[PDB]
Amino acid sequence: AIPCGESCVYIPCISVVIGCSCRNKVCYR
């Protein structure tokens, strides 16, 4: 799993374009 730094705590991941999915409130690939 790749931590994208960004999280989906407040709002969903913007890093979804990179393939980062909202996983445990954090954006992980």
Distance CA 8, CA 22 (A): 6
Interrupted after residues, the chain (C–N over 2.5 Å) = none
Q: Which residues contact 23 (CB under 8 A, 6 or more apart)?
A: 1
Question: Other CB atoms closer than 10 Å to residue 8's CB: what's the count?
Answer: 20
* CB distance 27 to 1 below 8 Å: no
* CB distance 26 to 7 below 8 Å: yes
* Coil/strand/helix, residue 26: strand
Method: NMR
Q: Which residues contact 22 (CB under 8 A, 6 or more apart)?
A: 8, 12, 13
